[PDB]
Design a protein around this ligand. Sequence first.
Ligand code: F43
Ligand code: F43
Ligand SMILES: C[C@@H](OP(=O)(O)O)[C@H](NC(=O)CCCCCCS)C(=O)O
Ligand SMILES: C[C@@H](OP(=O)(O)O)[C@H](NC(=O)CCCCCCS)C(=O)O
Ligand SMILES: O=S(=O)(O)CCS
Ligand SMILES: [K+]
Ligand SMILES: [Mg+2]
Ligand SMILES: [Mg+2]
Ligand SMILES: [Mg+2]
Ligand SMILES: [Mg+2]
Ligand SMILES: [Mg+2]
Ligand SMILES: [Mg+2]
Ligand SMILES: [Mg+2]
Lengths: 442, 442, 548, 246
Amino acid sequence: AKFEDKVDLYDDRGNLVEEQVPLEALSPLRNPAIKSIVQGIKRTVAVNLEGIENALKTAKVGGPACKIMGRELDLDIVGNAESIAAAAKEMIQVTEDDDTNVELLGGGKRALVQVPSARFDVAAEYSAAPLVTATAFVQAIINEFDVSMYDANMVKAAVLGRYPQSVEYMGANIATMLDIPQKLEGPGYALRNIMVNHVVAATLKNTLQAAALSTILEQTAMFEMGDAVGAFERMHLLGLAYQGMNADNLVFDLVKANGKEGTVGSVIADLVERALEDGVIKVEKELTDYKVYGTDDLAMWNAYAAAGLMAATMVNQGAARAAQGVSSTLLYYNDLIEFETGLPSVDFGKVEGTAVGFSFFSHSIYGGGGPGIFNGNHIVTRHSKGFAIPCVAAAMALDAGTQMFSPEATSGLIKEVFSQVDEFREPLKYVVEAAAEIKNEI
Amino acid sequence: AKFEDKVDLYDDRGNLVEEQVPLEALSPLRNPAIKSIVQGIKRTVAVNLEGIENALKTAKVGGPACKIMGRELDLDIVGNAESIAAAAKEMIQVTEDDDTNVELLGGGKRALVQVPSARFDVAAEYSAAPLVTATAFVQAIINEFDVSMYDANMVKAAVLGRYPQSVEYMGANIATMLDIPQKLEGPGYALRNIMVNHVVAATLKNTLQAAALSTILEQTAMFEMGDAVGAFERMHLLGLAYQGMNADNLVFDLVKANGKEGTVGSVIADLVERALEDGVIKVEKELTDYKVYGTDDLAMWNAYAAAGLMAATMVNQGAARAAQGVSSTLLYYNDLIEFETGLPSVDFGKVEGTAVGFSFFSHSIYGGGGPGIFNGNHIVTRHSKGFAIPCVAAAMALDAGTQMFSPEATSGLIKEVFSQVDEFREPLKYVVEAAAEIKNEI
Amino acid sequence: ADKLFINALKKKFEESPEEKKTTFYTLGGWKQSERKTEFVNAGKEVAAKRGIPQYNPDIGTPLGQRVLMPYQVSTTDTYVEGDDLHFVNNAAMQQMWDDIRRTVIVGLNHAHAVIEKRLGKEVTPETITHYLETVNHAMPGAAVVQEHMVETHPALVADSYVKVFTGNDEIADEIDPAFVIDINKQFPEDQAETLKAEVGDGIWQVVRIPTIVSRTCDGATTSRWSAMQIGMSMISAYKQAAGEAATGDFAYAAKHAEVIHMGTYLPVRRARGENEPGGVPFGYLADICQSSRVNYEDPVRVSLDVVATGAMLYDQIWLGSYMSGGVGFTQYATAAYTDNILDDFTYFGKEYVEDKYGLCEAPNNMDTVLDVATEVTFYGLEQYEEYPALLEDQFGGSQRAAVVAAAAGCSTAFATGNAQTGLSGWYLSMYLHKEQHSRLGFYGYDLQDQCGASNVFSIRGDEGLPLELRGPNYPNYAMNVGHQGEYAGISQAPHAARGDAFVFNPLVKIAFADDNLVFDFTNVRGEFAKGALREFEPAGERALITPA
Amino acid sequence: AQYYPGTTKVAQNRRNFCNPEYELEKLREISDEDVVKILGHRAPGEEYPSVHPPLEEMDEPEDAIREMVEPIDGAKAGDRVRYIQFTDSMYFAPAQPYVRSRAYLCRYRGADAGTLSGRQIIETRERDLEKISKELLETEFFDPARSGVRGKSVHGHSLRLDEDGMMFDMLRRQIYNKDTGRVEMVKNQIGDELDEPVDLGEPLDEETLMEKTTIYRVDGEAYRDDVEAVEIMQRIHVLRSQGGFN
Ligand code: F43
Ligand code: F43
Ligand SMILES: C[C@@H](OP(=O)(O)O)[C@H](NC(=O)CCCCCCS)C(=O)O
Ligand SMILES: C[C@@H](OP(=O)(O)O)[C@H](NC(=O)CCCCCCS)C(=O)O
Ligand SMILES: O=S(=O)(O)CCS
Ligand SMILES: [K+]
Ligand SMILES: [Mg+2]
Ligand SMILES: [Mg+2]
Ligand SMILES: [Mg+2]
Ligand SMILES: [Mg+2]
Ligand SMILES: [Mg+2]
Ligand SMILES: [Mg+2]
Ligand SMILES: [Mg+2]
C-alpha cells in the first residue's frame, strides 16, 4: 500500500462487515467491484422495444413533436421480442457464451443489454455500447419482418433518432447512464455526466446506496481526470471511504445521533467533537473565548468533515423529505464549520462554492433546475472534486414527492433496466465485499 | 468459425509467414496484437521536457505567440531529467511492477510515457493518458526544484497549455496520437482522429507498415462505431486483411507487376484479371463488345478491389514520389473500375466520393490542406468506412519531400517517441504473428 | 406554351435563345453594368475617405468580357443583376435568416403542470392571457419586478413578441386573439384539421427575440433570452416569490424540457450553437417555408418555394459565409430560383408523372426511380443542348447538376409519395449527367454524389436517416454547395403531392404562419425580389440611436 | 481492357482516349521551346528548379514498395510538381473533362488529375509534365478553337462560340488569324504575353469535330440513344444502392 490508513467497513444497516481494511482496497484502481461497476456502466444499454414500435407505427421519429406523414410501419416488435432479442444478441456478442447479456423486461416492452466487455478492451471509449446495440436491434427488426430497402431507414430513425444530423441520439428509443463524449466539459469527465436522478433510480432510492454509487462514479472520474494522482490521491480515497462508503460507520452514527431532533448545526457540533476525540484536530491556540483548531492531517480532516456534510444532508433533507435544501446544506455546513473551527471546509471551499452556484441555479430564472437534473459534468456542479454530488444523490433519494423533474419523470427507462443489475443497485454491498476479499493483497 | 474464409499472410518483404489463417484471427475483436496496439495508443504520451523548460524560461505559455512578461522561471529540467522522470513514474504507475513505462530519449530532452493499462480498465475513455502524465510531470518538476506556490501555475501552463480556458491542451508540451474526445465527429470516432502524418512518422515511412497501422486503426474504429456488426462484419474484415494486411500477397504482387512502368489503369487491368482467375467475379452478360461482370460475393469483390486500390496508390504516388495525387488515384481507380466491369467500386462508391471531396480540399482555397493533415475523423475524409485513409498513409510514406506540412513539420515529437514502440512501428509483423498464434482458437 | 425560361433568355441576350454564335469583348467590361458602375464609384469614395484602397475594377481580371446578365426572380416579373441577389446586398435575405435565428418554440405544457401541481394554482385562458400580456412587455427587454431597472428602447425591439397556439379550438378562442396563431385562419380546412390533431390540447409559445440582439449575438442566444423573460413573466403573472425553488422548474422547462430549437448545435470542426443554419434539418426548412398553406393546389410551386428558401439560406449565407465567405456563392443558389428554369424542368417532370402514373400512385421502388429520374434528367439536359443561351446562363456545371437533379428527384418523389426514393433519383440524375456531358460540377461537387446511392437506404449509424431528418450536418452533406436547398425541396415534394400539412414538424409549420414576422414566408421568391430592388424594410437597424 | 460500354462513335472515342495502345492522332507540330513557353513555369534555358534533393542523394531505408516502383525521371531529379490545365467546349471539343482524367490515369505515370466542369488539370514532376504536355497539345486531345490551355479564368466551356468558331476566353490567350485560318497562342496558360506567338494550326472542321468528339448531345449522338452505356450507369446505381443497404 502507498498509504498507512485502514478503515472499518459496514453494511447499509450500520452493522460491521470487516475491520481494519487498507484504504487502497477501496481505490477505483484496485477494487474489482468498482472495476465491474464502471465496465458495467460503460457497456449497459436500455432498449425500449415498445417505444421503437410506437415510433414506427406513428412515424414519430427524430425528436420532440416530429412526424413524417406517409412513412408509418406497423410491426409487431413487442409480440416478437424473443426472436428479435435473440437475433440482436447473436450480432452483439463476440463469442457464444461470453459476457453478453440480452434480457427482456416488462413482457417484452424493454430489454436490458450488456455489450461484451471485450468490445471495450479494443475501443477508445464507451460509445460502442449504444452503437453496437442500436445497429444489432435495427438489423434484427429488419430481418424479423423482412423490412424492405425502401422502408428500413425508418427503423434506424426509430431506434437512434436524428443522429447524425444531430450530434446526440435525438429522439432515440435506447438509453444509457452515460452521455456522448462530445458533451464532456473536460477530458476525463464521462463518469461525471450521469444525472443524479439516474443514480437515485438505479439504487431504488436507498439513501446509502445512492450516495455510494454517486461517490464511486465521482471519485473514479477524479482518477481519470488525474486529480487523484500524486499529492491528492489520499485526499480523494479518504473522501470516497468516509463520505461515500460509510467508513468507520461515521456517517451512519452522526445521522443516528441527529436524526430525531437535529439540524445542520447539531451535526457540525458532533463532527467537530468526534474529530477532536480521534486526534484528527487539536486546539492550536486560544483567542478570546474562542479556540482555534489545527490539524496535522488535512486530508483526514477533510474526510471527517465530508462525512459530517453527508450526515447533515441526510438530517436536513431527511427531516424535510424535500431535496431542495441540499444546496443550502452544502453551503452552510461548510460556511458554519469554518467559523466554528478556524479550519478550511470540505474541498478547501470548493463544496461551499459549488453550493452557492447550485443554490442560485436551483432557485432562479437563469438555468439549472431541481436537484435531480444536476451531475458532476453540469457547469453548475462540476467544481468540487467529488464531494458535492453524492450529497445531492442522498437528498433526492430522500425526497418524498416534491419535485416535478423527479426520477420517475426523467429516469423510468433507466430505472427499469439498470436497477436489475445487482452491482449498480447495491454497490455499497459489492464494493465492501470486494475490498474485504483483497484486503491482504494491498 | 463465423466465417469460413482463410487468408495467407506475408511479411513486408513479400515472403510467406503463415498460410490458411482463419479470417477472424485478424479481427480487432480477437487478435491480441491489435488489442495491444489499440491499448498502447490509448495509453502512450510523448513528453517534451526541453519544450517545457524553454516555455518556462521565456514565459511563452498558452499558445502561439503568447508570453507573460515577468513570469519567467529558469529550471534545469533536462539536466535533472532522470530524477524528474522517476518521480513522475512513481505517481503514474498503479503498482511497482505493472506495465507503466517512462523512458528518456534524446539525452533527457524527451520522454516516452505509457500509462498503466489498468487505469484505462476503470476509465470511460482515454484522456487519463495525457491528464495523468501531465499532472505527474507538473508535480515532479515542482518537487524537484521546490517551486513555490506562487510560481507553480506556470509549470502547469508550460506542460498542458491554456486548458481549461481552451477546450484543447492549447500550447501543451505533451503530445498523443489521439485527440480530445470533444473533437470526435461522432461517437465511436476516436481511433479515426489520428493524423496521417502521425501514422507515417511512427512507422518511419515504411509504406506497407504505414498502410497496415492506418488500416488497423480505421477498421478497429469501424467495430467501435458498429459499422462492422452483423451484415457488414465480413466486408470489414476482408478489407482489413486484403487492403491493409497484404493478404495473399495481392497488394505486393500487383505493385511488383506494375511498379516499373505501370499506371492506375494497368493495375486495374491486373486486378480484374486476378479476380476472374480466382472466381471472385464472372461474366454475367455480353453487351456489344463488352462483358458485364457479376459476383456472388460482394464483400470479396470489394476486398480485391480495395487491394487493387492500395496497389494503384503505391504505383501512382510511388512513381511521382509525391503524395498529392492520392486524391486522384482514390477517385479514378474507382471510377475507371466501374466502367471497366459493371461492378460497384470500393465501398460501393464511398471511396470515390471521399476522393472527390479530398481532391477538392487538397487543391482549393476552401479548407483541407496536404494529404498528411487528413485523418478518418476529418470532415472531408470520414465518409468511406476505412478504405480510403490507409491509401493516404501509403502515399505520404512514399512522398520524397514535396509537402510543406510533412511529417517532419507536424509530427516530430510523435515520431521520436511513438516510433520507439515496436508494435506501433512494425504492426504488420505483430498482427500476423498473433493471428498465426490464435489460428486454432477461431 | 413557350418553355418557362424563354422570356428570361430573350431579356438577357440580343440573339434568339437557340442561336449558337455570338460576339464577345465589345461591351466595355464592367462599364456595361449599372451595378458594377455603382460599385466602381463607391469603391473610389470608400478608399478616399478611409485612406486604404478598396474596390478596384483593374485588380485581377476584367469582368464583363461577356454579357453580365440580368436574372429574372422565378415566379416574378423582376429582373436584376445578380449582385442584387448577394445576401450582403439584399436585406430581405438577411431578414429571412434573422427571423429563423431569433425564433424558438417553447411549450407551456410542463410549465402549466408546474403551476397546478407544484404552486397549487389554477391555469385557465384568462390566466394564460394575463401571462401573455406580461411576457409581451418583458420579452423585448423590459422589467416587471425590480426597482431601478434599465430597459431596451421599445422601438429598437419592436419585432420581438410571443404568440401561442393550441389544437383545441375552444381554448384557442378564449385566449386574447392578439396573441394567438389561429390555425383555422391560416391553414386550409384539411391542413388545419391535421395540424390541430397533431397539437391536440398542447399549448405552445412562439417566441421571437429582437433582430438587433440576434445580430449582435448568435442563434444560441435565442432560447436563453426567451427563457429569461418567460421566467420573469411566470414570476409576475402567477405571483411566485421572485426566485424560489419552483422558479428553477420553469427555467429547465423553457431551456431544455419543452424547447424546440430551429437548429441543433454542431460538432467542433464547424463549432456553432443552436439556431444556426447548419443545424436546421431539411424537413424543418420545408416547414418554415409557408408556401404549403397558400399554394397547395400546385405542388411544384410549393416544392420550388422551399428550394428557393433553402438554396439561399444554405448556399449563400451558410456555406457561402458562415462556412467560407468572400464573394461567396450567389449564383450557385440563384440557379435554383431564377429564370423559371428549375420550374420548367419540374413542371415537365410533374406532368410526365401525372401521365404515366398519377401523383403518388407509382410503386415506391427502384423501378420508379429509374424511370422518372432518367426521363426528367434527359429533358433538362436537352434544354441546355437545344438552347445555347440557356447553357451560357447556367454556365457552371454545378448549377446545372443541382437544377437537373432537383427536378428529377422532386419528380420521383411526386410519383412515389416518398422522399427516400426522391433522393435516390437525385443521385441517379447526377450519374447520368456526368456520363452524358463528361462533366458534372466543381472539383468537389460529387463527394456526396458518389457516396449517395449507397447511403440513400443504408441503416448504419452515421449513414442511415430518412431524408426529412437529414440536414447540413449529415456527414456527406456538410461541405458542398448545390445540394442542401435542393434536398429541402425533395423533402417537401412528396408531402406537397400528398397534400400533407407538414413535412417533419407540425409545430414548426404553425410557428411561421404569422404575418407579424418581418419576412413573408408565404412568398419567399417575391421577398427576394423585393430585397433585390432595395424595397424591403428589415428590423434591427440602429438609426434611432445614431446621428441623424 | 474494355474501358467504357456503348455503341456510338462517342463511346468508341472515350475508349480510344483511355487505351494506351490507341495511337492518338497527331494534328500539329509544336517545338519543345514552345511547349515550355505555353506552360509558363520556367524560362527558355532555365534549369529545372527543385523542391527536394535528387533521390540518389537521400539516405532512404529499405522499403520493398519503393524498391519495386520506378520513379519518374523528374522524381529522380527532385523537380517541382507543376501543371497544365485545359477547358473543353461543350460544342463538340474532342476531349472533355472526365474523358481526360480517366485517360490520363490509364496512359501516364505519377499523375494527379482533377476534373471540373470548366477546367481539367494534371499535376506531375516538371520535366515529365513537359513530355506529357507536348502530346496533349499536338494530338486530338486538343483543338485550338474548341479547347483552351488555361491556368486561371477558365469560363467558356458552356458559352456560345464566337463568329470565328472560337471558344470564349476572358484573357484571349488563343487568337484565330483570318489570314491563315490558323490559331496562334499569344499568351501562356496563365495569361502573360508571349514574346512570339505559337502556331497551333487550323481548327478542326465540323465533320472532323463530329468524328472525334466525346460529348453526347441531342444534335450529335444523344446519350439516351446509347442504350448500352445507359444500362451500365443504371446498373451501377442499383448495385451501389443494394450494397449500401445489405
Ligand atoms: C427575480 C430575481 C431572481 C432571478 O433569478 N433574477 C431576479 C430578477 C432578474 C431580472 C429583473 C428584471 C425585472 O424586474 O423584470 C433581470 C433584469 C434579468 C432579466 N431577466 O433580464 C435581473 N435580475 Ni436580479 N438584477 C440585479 C441585481 C439584483 C439584486 C438587487 C438587490 C437590491 O437591493 O436591489 C438582487 C440579488 C441580491 O439581493 O443581491 C436581485 C434579485 C433578483 N434577480 C430576483 C428579484 C428581486 C426582487 O424581487 O426585487 N437582482 C443587482 O444587485 C444589481 C444589478 C441588477 C440587474 C440589472 C442590471 O444589471 O442593470 C438585475 C438582473
Ligand atoms: C480559384 C478557384 C478554385 C477555388 O478554390 N475556388 C475558385 C474561385 C472561387 C472564388 C472566385 C472569386 C474571384 O474570382 O475572386 C469564389 C467566388 C469564392 C470566394 N472566394 O468568394 C468562388 N470560386 Ni469558383 N465559383 C463558381 C463556379 C466555379 C466554376 C466556374 C466554371 C465556369 O465555366 O465559369 C469552376 C469549377 C468548375 O469548373 O465546375 C470554379 C472554379 C474556381 N473557383 C477556381 C477558379 C476558376 C478560374 O480560374 O476561372 N468555380 C461556378 O460554377 C458557378 C458559381 C461560382 C461561384 C460564385 C457564385 O456562386 O456567384 C464561385 C465561387
Ligand atoms: C447554467 C447553464 O444553464 P443550464 O443549466 O444549462 O440551463 C448556462 N447558463 C448560465 O450560465 C447563465 C449565465 C448568465 C446568467 C446568470 C449570470 S449570474 C447555460 O445556459 O448554458
Ligand atoms: C472542410 C472544413 O475546413 P477545414 O479543413 O477544417 O479547414 C470546413 N470547410 C468547408 O466545409 C468549406 C465549405 C464551404 C466552402 C466550400 C463549398 S463547396 C470548415 O471550415 O470547417
Ligand atoms: O475550382 S473548385 O472546384 O475547386 C472551386 C469551385 S468554386
Ligand atoms: K450575429
Ligand atoms: Mg456502533
Ligand atoms: Mg451533539
Ligand atoms: Mg515549497
Ligand atoms: Mg465476345
Ligand atoms: Mg492607389
Ligand atoms: Mg406581410
Ligand atoms: Mg517535334
